[PDB]
């Protein structure tokens, strides 16, 4: 399967006193591996997976240096946007940035990302060709012009196509025991009777990794989306994920229905029946 490395940055201005709250997190696939929080005592990039703790002091000094510089960029960004949108210094505002790279099963570059939002709305995004920009409004147009004049797309492309994938490959090897392991879902069904005429069947998928999964219901071998509910995939808290799907059925016809589970860790999809 494909793999990814992604960094997520959030800065929130604090108008009453002091500088913005800055939080940075890094993921390989669905595994968080580093964090920085401006409100934390260390003022260091910190590990959040065992395999990154293998990295020595020079790594941690470099990532701390870079993340603090990222923090200052976002501080300045909040100021710039306040000017572009003619807002006062009274209100709190948010900037968000995400960047990173995808590789395929062969670990070769697949796609790169670098995109930005202000107060939860699209601001500017690097297009898939890594050579042009999607600017959502006239403020973002001004940024696009600046970045086009300074050859920013070329700088980001070099990182996203090269250094980024080199980092990802290094992490995939160093964290092979978990990062290259798939955890297949542990599945079971439950039954809930609301009346003498109605029953709910729920199909559970637990303790799986990666997070991507498909749960589907069939009646008599054909798909059914009606009278079905599918919850958002949720973290178990131990690195794995959970999901359920439910279908409302006439009491006594439970046996007609089947839940089907598709996941990377399953060579063949599973079928469950009450």
């Amino acid at each position: 399967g494909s793999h990814s490395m992604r960094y997520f940055f959030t800065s929130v201005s604090r108008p009453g006193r002091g500088e913005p709250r800055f939080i940075a997190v890094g993921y390989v696939d669905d595994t968080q591996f580093v964090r920085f929080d401006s409100d934390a005592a260390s003022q260091r990039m910190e590990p959040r997976a065992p395999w990154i703790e293998q990295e020595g002091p020079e790594y941690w000094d470099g990532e701390t240096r870079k993340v603090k510089a990222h923090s200052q960029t976002h501080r300045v960004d909040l100021g710039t946007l306040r000017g572009y949108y003619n807002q006062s210094e009274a209100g709190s505002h948010t900037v968000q940035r995400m960047y990173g790279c995808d590789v395929g099963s062969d670990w070769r570059f697949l796609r790169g990302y670098h995109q930005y939002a202000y107060d939860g709305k699209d601001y500017i995004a690097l297009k898939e060709d890594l050579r042009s920009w999607t600017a959502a409004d006239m403020a973002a147009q001004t940024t696009k012009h600046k970045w086009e004049a300074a050859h920013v797309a070329e700088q980001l492309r070099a990182y996203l196509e090269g250094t980024c994938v080199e980092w990802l490959r290094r992490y995939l090897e160093n964290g092979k025991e978990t990062l290259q392991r798939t955890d297949a879902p542990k599945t079971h069904m439950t039954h809930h009777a609301v009346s003498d005429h109605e029953a709910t069947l729920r199909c559970w998928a637990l303790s799986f990794y990666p997070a991507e999964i498909t749960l589907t219901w069939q009646r008599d071998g054909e798909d059914q989306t009606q009278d079905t509910e599918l919850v958002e995939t949720r973290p178990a808290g131990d690195g794995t994920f959970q999901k359920w799907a439910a279908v409302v059925v006439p009491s006594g016809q439970e046996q007609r229905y089947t839940c089907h589970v598709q996941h990377e860790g399953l060579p063949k999809p599973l079928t469950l029946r009450w």
Binding site: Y7, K66, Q155, Y159
Partner: peptide, 9 residues
């Protein structure tokens, strides 16, 4: 690892 520098808006 993070990029060496990111662009300001």
């Amino acid at each position: 690892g993070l990029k060496e520098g990111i662009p300001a808006l």
